[PDB]
């Protein structure tokens, strides 16, 4: 196959790809806020108990046994 040309034509940040990388940087930058906010989940948003995943698992052993 022929070598790719060195022609480039960038464009304004209109594609979701641009934001995709923008939010990624903000994530590691807002870590403190994330932990601090989640820590106060007791405010009422504590209905995300991940430990429940294991509770239901044992409750439904079928998922483990052949279907």
Q: Read off the tokens for 9.
A: 């034509």
Please tell me what DSSP assigns to residue 50: T
Q: Where are the domains of the chain?
A: 1-67
Q: Are 57 and 63 within 8 A, CB to CB? A: yes
How far apart, in Å, do the first and last CA atoms of the chain sit? Answer: 49
Q: Are 13 and 19 within 8 A, CB to CB? A: yes
- Please give the method by which this entry was determined: NMR
Contacts of 41 (CB under 8 A, 6+ apart): 48
Among residues 54, 35, 38, the alpha carbon closest in space to that of 46 is found at 38
């Amino acid at each position: 196959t022929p070598i790719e040309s060195h022609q480039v034509e960038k464009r304004k940040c209109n594609t979701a790809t641009c934001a995709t990388q923008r939010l990624a940087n903000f994530l590691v930058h807002s870590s403190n806020n994330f932990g601090a906010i989640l820590s106060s989940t007791n405010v009422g948003s504590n209905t995300y108990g991940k430990r429940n995943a294991v509770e239901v698992l044992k409750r439904e052993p079928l998922n483990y046994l052949p279907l």
